[PDB]
Amino acid sequence: GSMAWFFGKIPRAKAEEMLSKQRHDGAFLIRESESAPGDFSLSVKFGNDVQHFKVLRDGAGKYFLWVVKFNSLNELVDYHRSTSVSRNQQIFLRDI
Amino acid sequence: APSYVNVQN
Incomplete structure (x- = not known):
């Protein structure tokens, strides 16, 4: 089915809400x-903050966040379900 | 441009 995590063009502040x-x-x-038109952003909740x-x-x-590179957004998302997106906190992606 | 955790300013 469709991905549950792609929200199109929503403002940063609405993603935090x-x-x-x-x-x-x-x-x-x-x-x-x-x-930045043409770029994607990843917004994530951790520890009462976004x-x-x-x-x-x-x-x-x-595509990449730090060092490991991927051929699609879908592959970058699924890699980060089990490897943290942050270098200082353990934040593993979970679908809404 | 606002900031992103993985883009150093």
Whole structure:
């Protein structure tokens, strides 16, 4: 079926409003950025707060958050269900 | 441009 985590072009502040209401750590969504057209953002809840990450793209067209590169957003999301998205906190993605 | 955890300012 369709992915549960793709929310299209929603404002940053609306993504924080929606995620704040979730109760589990790791609840997340991918959105199309309004400040940087053509880029995607990953918004995730952890520890009563919401953090935003930019999905980076390199010179081969691959997507990544830090070092490990992926050929699709779907592969980057599923890798981060079991490897943290943060370097200082353990934040594993969980669908809303 | 706002900030992102993985984009160092």
